[PDB]
Amino acid sequence: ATRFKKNRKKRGHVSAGHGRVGKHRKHPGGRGKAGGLHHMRINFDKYHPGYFGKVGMRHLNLLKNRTYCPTINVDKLWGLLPEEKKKEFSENKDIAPVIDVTRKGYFKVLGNGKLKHNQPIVVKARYFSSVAEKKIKAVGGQCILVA
Amino acid sequence: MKFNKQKSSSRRKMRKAHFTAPAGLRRKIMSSKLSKELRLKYKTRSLPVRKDDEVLICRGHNHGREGKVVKINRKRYKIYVERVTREKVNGESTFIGIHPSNVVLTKLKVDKNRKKILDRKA
Amino acid sequence: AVKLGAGYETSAESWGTGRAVARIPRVPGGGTHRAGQGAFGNMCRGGGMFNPTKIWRRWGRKVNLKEKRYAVCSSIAASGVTSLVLARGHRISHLKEVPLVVSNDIESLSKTKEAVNFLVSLGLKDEVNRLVKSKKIRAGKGKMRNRKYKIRNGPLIIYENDNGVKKAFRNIPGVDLCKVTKLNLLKLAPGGSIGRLCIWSESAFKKLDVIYGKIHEKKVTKKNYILPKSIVHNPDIYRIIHSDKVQASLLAKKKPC
RNA sequence: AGCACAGUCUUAACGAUGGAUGUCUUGGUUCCUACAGCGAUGAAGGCCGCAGCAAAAUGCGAUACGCAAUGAAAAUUGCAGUGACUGAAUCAUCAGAAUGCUGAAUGUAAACUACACCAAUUCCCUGGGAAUAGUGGUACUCCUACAGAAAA
RNA sequence: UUUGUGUUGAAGCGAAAUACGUGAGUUUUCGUGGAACAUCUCCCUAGUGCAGAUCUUGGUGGAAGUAGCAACUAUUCAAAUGAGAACUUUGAAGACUGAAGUGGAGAAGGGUUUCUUGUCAACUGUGAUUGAACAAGAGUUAGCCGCUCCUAAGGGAUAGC
RNA sequence: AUUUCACUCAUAUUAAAUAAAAUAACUCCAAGUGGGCCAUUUUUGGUAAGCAGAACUGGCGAUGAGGGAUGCUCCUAACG
RNA sequence: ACGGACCAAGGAGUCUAGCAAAUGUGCAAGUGUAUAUGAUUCUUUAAACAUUUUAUACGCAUAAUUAAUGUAAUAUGUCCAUUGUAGAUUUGUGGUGCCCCACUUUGCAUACAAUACCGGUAAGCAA
RNA sequence: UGAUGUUAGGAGGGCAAAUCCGCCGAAUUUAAGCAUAUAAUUAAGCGGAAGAAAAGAAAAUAACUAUGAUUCCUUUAGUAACGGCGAGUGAACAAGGACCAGCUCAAACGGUUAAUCCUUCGUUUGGUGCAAACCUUUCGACGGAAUUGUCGUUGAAUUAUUCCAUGAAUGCCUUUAAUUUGAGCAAAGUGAGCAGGAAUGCUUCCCCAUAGAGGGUGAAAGGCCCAUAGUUCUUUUUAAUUUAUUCAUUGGAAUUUUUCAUGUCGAGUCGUGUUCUUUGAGAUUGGAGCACUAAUACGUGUGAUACAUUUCACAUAAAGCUAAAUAUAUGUAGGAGACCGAUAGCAAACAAGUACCGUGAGGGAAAGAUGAAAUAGUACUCAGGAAUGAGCAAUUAAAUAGUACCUGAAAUCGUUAAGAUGGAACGGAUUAAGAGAGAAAACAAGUAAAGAGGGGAA
Numbered sequence A: 001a002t003r004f005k006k007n008r009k010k011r012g013h014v015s016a017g018h019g020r021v022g023k024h025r026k027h028p029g030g031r032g033k034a035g036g037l038h039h040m041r042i043n044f045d046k047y048h049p050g051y052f053g054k055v056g057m058r059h060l061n062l063l064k065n066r067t068y069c070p071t072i073n074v075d076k077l078w079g080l081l082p083e084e085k086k087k088e089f090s091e092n093k094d095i096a097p098v099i100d101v102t103r104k105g106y107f108k109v110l111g112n113g114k115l116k117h118n119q120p121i122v123v124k125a126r127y128f129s130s131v132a133e134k135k136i137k138a139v140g141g142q143c144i145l146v147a
Numbered sequence B: 001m002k003f004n005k006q007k008s009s010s011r012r013k014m015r016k017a018h019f020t021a022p023a024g025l026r027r028k029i030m031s032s033k034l035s036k037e038l039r040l041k042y043k044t045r046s047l048p049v050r051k052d053d054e055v056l057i058c059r060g061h062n063h064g065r066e067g068k069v070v071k072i073n074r075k076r077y078k079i080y081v082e083r084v085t086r087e088k089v090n091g092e093s094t095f096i097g098i099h100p101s102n103v104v105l106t107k108l109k110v111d112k113n114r115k116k117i118l119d120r121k122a
Numbered sequence C: 001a002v003k004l005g006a007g008y009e010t011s012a013e014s015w016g017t018g019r020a021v022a023r024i025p026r027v028p029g030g031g032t033h034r035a036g037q038g039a040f041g042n043m044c045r046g047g048g049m050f051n052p053t054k055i056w057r058r059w060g061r062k063v064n065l066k067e068k069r070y071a072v073c074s075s076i077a078a079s080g081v082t083s084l085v086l087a088r089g090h091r092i093s094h095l096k097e098v099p100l101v102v103s104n105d106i107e108s109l110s111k112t113k114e115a116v117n118f119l120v121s122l123g124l125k126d127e128v129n130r131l132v133k134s135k136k137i138r139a140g141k142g143k144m145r146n147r148k149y150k151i152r153n154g155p156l157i158i159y160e161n162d163n164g165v166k167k168a169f170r171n172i173p174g175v176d177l178c179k180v181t182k183l184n185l186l187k188l189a190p191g192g193s194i195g196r197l198c199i200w201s202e203s204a205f206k207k208l209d210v211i212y213g214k215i216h217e218k219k220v221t222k223k224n225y226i227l228p229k230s231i232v233h234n235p236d237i238y239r240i241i242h243s244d245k246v247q248a249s250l251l252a253k254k255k256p257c
Numbered sequence D: 001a002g003c004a005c006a007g008u009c010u011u012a013a014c015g016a017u018g019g020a021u022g023u024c025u026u027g028g029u030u031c032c033u034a035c036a037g038c039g040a041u042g043a044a045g046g047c048c049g050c051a052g053c054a055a056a057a058u059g060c061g062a063u064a065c066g067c068a069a070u071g072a073a074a075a076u077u078g079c080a081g082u083g084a085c086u087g088a089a090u091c092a093u094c095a096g097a098a099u100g101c102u103g104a105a106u107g108u109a110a111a112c113u114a115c116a117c118c119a120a121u122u123c124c125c126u127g128g129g130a131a132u133a134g135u136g137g138u139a140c141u142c143c144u145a146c147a148g149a150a151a152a
Numbered sequence E: 001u002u003u004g005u006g007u008u009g010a011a012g013c014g015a016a017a018u019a020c021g022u023g024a025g026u027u028u029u030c031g032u033g034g035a036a037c038a039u040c041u042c043c044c045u046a047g048u049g050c051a052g053a054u055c056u057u058g059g060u061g062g063a064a065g066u067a068g069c070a071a072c073u074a075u076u077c078a079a080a081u082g083a084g085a086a087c088u089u090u091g092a093a094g095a096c097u098g099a100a101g102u103g104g105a106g107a108a109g110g111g112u113u114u115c116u117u118g119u120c121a122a123c124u125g126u127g128a129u130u131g132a133a134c135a136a137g138a139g140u141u142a143g144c145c146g147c148u149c150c151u152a153a154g155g156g157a158u159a160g161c
Numbered sequence F: 001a002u003u004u005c006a007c008u009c010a011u012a013u014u015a016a017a018u019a020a021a022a023u024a025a026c027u028c029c030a031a032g033u034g035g036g037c038c039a040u041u042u043u044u045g046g047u048a049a050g051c052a053g054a055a056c057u058g059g060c061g062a063u064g065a066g067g068g069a070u071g072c073u074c075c076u077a078a079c080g
Numbered sequence G: 001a002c003g004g005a006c007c008a009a010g011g012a013g014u015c016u017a018g019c020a021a022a023u024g025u026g027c028a029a030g031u032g033u034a035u036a037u038g039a040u041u042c043u044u045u046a047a048a049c050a051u052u053u054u055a056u057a058c059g060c061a062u063a064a065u066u067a068a069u070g071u072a073a074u075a076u077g078u079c080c081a082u083u084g085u086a087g088a089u090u091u092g093u094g095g096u097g098c099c100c101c102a103c104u105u106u107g108c109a110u111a112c113a114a115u116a117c118c119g120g121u122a123a124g125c126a127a
Numbered sequence H: 001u002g003a004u005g006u007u008a009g010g011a012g013g014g015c016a017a018a019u020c021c022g023c024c025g026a027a028u029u030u031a032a033g034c035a036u037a038u039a040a041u042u043a044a045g046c047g048g049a050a051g052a053a054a055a056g057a058a059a060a061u062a063a064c065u066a067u068g069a070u071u072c073c074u075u076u077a078g079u080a081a082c083g084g085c086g087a088g089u090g091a092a093c094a095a096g097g098a099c100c101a102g103c104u105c106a107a108a109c110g111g112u113u114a115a116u117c118c119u120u121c122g123u124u125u126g127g128u129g130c131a132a133a134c135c136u137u138u139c140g141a142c143g144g145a146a147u148u149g150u151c152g153u154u155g156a157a158u159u160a161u162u163c164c165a166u167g168a169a170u171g172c173c174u175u176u177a178a179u180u181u182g183a184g185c186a187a188a189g190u191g192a193g194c195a196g197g198a199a200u201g202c203u204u205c206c207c208c209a210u211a212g213a214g215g216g217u218g219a220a221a222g223g224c225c226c227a228u229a230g231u232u233c234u235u236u237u238u239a240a241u242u243u244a245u246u247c248a249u250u251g252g253a254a255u256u257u258u259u260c261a262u263g264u265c266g267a268g269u270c271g272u273g274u275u276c277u278u279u280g281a282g283a284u285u286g287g288a289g290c291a292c293u294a295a296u297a298c299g300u301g302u303g304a305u306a307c308a309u310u311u312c313a314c315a316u317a318a319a320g321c322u323a324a325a326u327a328u329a330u331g332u333a334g335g336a337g338a339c340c341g342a343u344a345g346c347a348a349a350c351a352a353g354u355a356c357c358g359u360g361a362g363g364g365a366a367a368g369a370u371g372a373a374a375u376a377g378u379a380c381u382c383a384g385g386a387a388u389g390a391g392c393a394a395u396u397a398a399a400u401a402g403u404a405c406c407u408g409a410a411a412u413c414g415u416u417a418a419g420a421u422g423g424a425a426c427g428g429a430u431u432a433a434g435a436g437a438g439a440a441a442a443c444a445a446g447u448a449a450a451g452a453g454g455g456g457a458a
């Protein structure tokens, strides 16, 4: 809203806040990203260090749907269950839950965190990591591969 | 208008339509109210004023005077009554123009055309 | 917006330095007194505007759904406080209860005269008088733009199903109508003020517990919506201050300089 | 009957010149909705004409500010005139009739109202009786038929 | 959105005030004017505040009753008309052009300036009763004068490319 | 080295004096500047210059008041 | 040194895209109902209201690193939540006036360091 | 086989462009200079259509548990990639929606009989109009085109079950609900009083509303007028619903059974080399010129890095047609806005693309307002040649509203009065002397006697 703009405070002043000696002129240093590597070098180097040059191989026709893969850690793995359902399994001891994470939108199980001690759980997925699968085995569970 | 969107309620448009109306449409605009006695004999509430009718003046400096309409001027939107006159600076005599909506008419002059109108208007 | 290129439609150019005149572009030719005048520029007669207005100014805004619902809810609650309704300008010194629920026979009134009699008998005669006297002709250029009169806001009649209220309560100066399942904030808080006077029919009053999930029902209850909560349990701070527990922890009053 | 020096500058009151200010608006501007080409059966544009008294604009075309028909329906006017006791005075609609010279312009030409060839042409009564130098046709390219002639 | 002024005179404008405020400004009186005008209760919005840019458009000054109204030899006496005659008309004088003429007749260009009658708001850089100004009506007669026909330097087209 | 337990080293006059010492310390987003000049003392080039070039501090610029008749930079002294 | 004879009206940091910082608001491991569709929405309304009768549209966030095939965060002895110095708040005694000291208890935010683990590289082995 | 023909019947040509199709083709500018690059497959130039045009029924994707003609919206994504790898540039598949539709030639098969098509001339059935005209109709004759190829089938027979078209009369043609043109009808005061030239104002007394949108009327109107809410007729085109029947003939069409036959499938075209353009397309994405020039379905093409030998998937080039969802700075009609308010808004609120200027292509203004009414626009007298002035005379509520007419600022000038005045004038501080205005603090509550009003209570 034009009511609150800064320029209205300079309305009786001569130079509109831009200076007697250095004016407000039009493009006194170039246009856009003009002078990089010549007279804008310091800015480019201290704020965007790796900007110039190229590195790596080409990939000519990508097709990103071939490698799409969302992940989930073992922490959030008991939290997919309702709390009253989580209560029942921790009470009884000869039953365990079987969870299929692909039905929830995850493809690869990943292994950060701590599973509950002596509480078996069976997990279905497309890919597993080594540490995640070890942690699932240690508490008495099992991993299953699906496609 | 109020509830049909196919006609305008703009001041500009219908203030333009009033002052450039074709001569045929101006006679419907120049209408006057009927007296109580003529409102029982005929079911109608108002009629377009015609030449040889009789009227009573209800607003203006000449309120209360009665007479017979002698001329109708569709271009100036005014009527002229028989004994309501005026002096020019010369001394020549003319009529005073009255707007038909300032008037109630108390006696008609009927003929073939108005009969078929008063019949339908019942 | 303005016409796209107004004031720039000529073959004018500047005379250059010399000739002892300013360097603004000038219309060419001769034989008419338009020739040789200053052509375009925001300081010239017949020139262009500084920043010509465009049609791609962002005219509207997008508003979050939860905030809209929260505001409607907070605007219904304000409609139930006698002090707030009075301070908005409604003359209700003769009403009995401010929520003001009326039986379902209101929903099938059919003539304007009956609606006016109903309003008068409830105790709102001096308030329907405020509305009739308020019609005035506006000040300013709005009269040239189809904005002739200026009227004040009256009660808002809220119903569940319509058997004649719509047509009966029309035509009364200042009176609005609305159906319970489509409640509009632009009516409940005119111009941003709070405390509109509302008259509720009994069915309209009851549907209001289903709409907000106290009782559940398909295609009526707002899905998965939770009624908002407050950061204060009881806003009476001077009742807390005067309690014995707090008063026993204070310190003796001290002296100014 | 008498008394203020003149010029210059300052301030009040009443005026002159000029067209700001306020109020007004049959005009602009933008958005939304619907529909959509015209022409050799002569278009768009250009020129020339038409009223009782008639310059422009608007409307019309040798029937020329308007004819006929259909819906309303007494006036229309500066003067002069014209109209009923409803095909008439006026308004609207608009299907019939009429629509100058040009222009792609197309018989040959064009700062020409210049010059060709072919058919004389147009009415009224029901075979007669009249009038008029007046009317129509004639570019180039191409398709389907047809006609004869020629080569092979 | 709220709640207000006006034919018992709105907005605007001129001169002011024992008036308020440090200030930008509010508020009020008298006069003119003749139809609309606010909101400071709180909010929204913008083409929102001028001493200048050899700024843009319009209006007005000192200079100033000033510079100036000098080519082309030259005017005078009487009378008419008229409200009014140095520059309209008549008569008498003194002079000029001097056939390579402000004498006659055509072309290009102009388009009614031509004629008769009337007449002076503005114009005719002094006057003006004059006028190519203004108004109302008129006026251009061909077998033999020309165009129209012929071909020139040349232009435009046809067939083909 | 590091870690854990014991004992002990002036304070109220504060392990020397003085202190409108916390008006401190640290993050973020940005403006305007990047032609300077003058005076005392030190000092380079030049015969010298109201010439050119450096050092420490105070000023003019950005700043008016009293004095120096007058004066951007001197003396007193900085502003409801 | 340049512009300015006088007066009135006009006259110059704005709009859109894209990013960030600051601040206000809502919800929170989630958040934003896209294009559409629905409705006893239809002067206003081109607004407002709704969401398909153990629930996979899409964006940003919830996981990094490498040119890359790829790989992917203490670890099952305990649902426990790595270590130390200073430090807000709390617990129990005593001193001078709820405050400040002394001892004791707990140990937020944060600052400075240590350690373990994930991706790349080097080294030592290496089916 | 060319040509000829004022032979009969017909077509093309020019204007207009906002959206659409085809060609041709810059520089300014950015890179802080500049040549590739950018501007841009843009502006200018030349051709061709429609209410839309173009595109379009796989020689397409993918790599999956697979999708399935074209177009457009939300995303993919400022991503893969291009680039003096600088400045800068920049797509496709999957996913969610709108809409939704498929077909014809060529080639194969039909020879006890081209089945096919067109011009001209007749004639024959039912409807609609006042008329003008217009629908519907199957019969024939002469003439011509075509075997240098029109028409039918869509591989050809046989079995059963079912569907379609085609003629006869008494045969019925009823109600309702929507969708659009044009007409008619359409409540309630012209009541006191004040002031006014004139109420639509103020104060009181009534009322109507399915109508309190807007405009007009001598000042602001729900009840004065047109219209407005509503309702009744009328004109289109379209859904149901209501009714068949008994008899006749010839042709077609889908599957289901038994058999045979294994066909055809677009050439100086594709492709390769080379040159120039264009693209995100990189040992080359599309197009084009020149040279060379294929195979026959077990073939040919695509699967984003140049080769040789192979596996696998997908599709079937070199002929044609097609509605919807999409666009619209043009023309015409309708509605509307937190838009401008006569130096503003279109150049133009008015005899505006007009007056006027230029040899020409072209350039292009200024200019709105008396009053309610002029059906009130200035009668009469005196002075003066006139213009004009004055009045005891005159319209209006008003002429200091007199047509150059609402209001009527500043610059600049006139008249009267009061002051100042030795080579500028104004000004800051502080007082004095004059002149003009002023009582809201700049004195007096109350008591008493009248006189004139205005309220409250029992």
Ligand SMILES: [Mg+2]
Binding pocket: A013
């Ligand atoms: Mg400053």
Ligand SMILES: [Mg+2]
Binding pocket: A015, A019, A020
């Ligand atoms: Mg400056």
Ligand SMILES: [Mg+2]
Binding pocket: A021, A022
């Ligand atoms: Mg500088």
Ligand SMILES: [Mg+2]
Binding pocket: C020
């Ligand atoms: Mg000069």
Ligand SMILES: [Mg+2]
Binding pocket: C006, C007, C046, C047
């Ligand atoms: Mg303009």
Ligand SMILES: [Mg+2]
Binding pocket: C140, C141
């Ligand atoms: Mg105003």
Ligand SMILES: [Mg+2]
Binding pocket: none
């Ligand atoms: Mg004197």
Ligand SMILES: [Mg+2]
Binding pocket: none
């Ligand atoms: Mg066409």
Ligand SMILES: [Mg+2]
Binding pocket: D047, D048
């Ligand atoms: Mg013509």
Ligand SMILES: [Mg+2]
Binding pocket: D087
């Ligand atoms: Mg008849």
Ligand SMILES: [Mg+2]
Binding pocket: D087
């Ligand atoms: Mg008739």
Ligand SMILES: [Mg+2]
Binding pocket: none
């Ligand atoms: Mg010709």
Ligand SMILES: [Mg+2]
Binding pocket: none
């Ligand atoms: Mg000639």
Ligand SMILES: [Mg+2]
Binding pocket: none
């Ligand atoms: Mg040709």
Ligand SMILES: [Mg+2]
Binding pocket: none
């Ligand atoms: Mg005001």
Ligand SMILES: [Mg+2]
Binding pocket: none
């Ligand atoms: Mg008035």
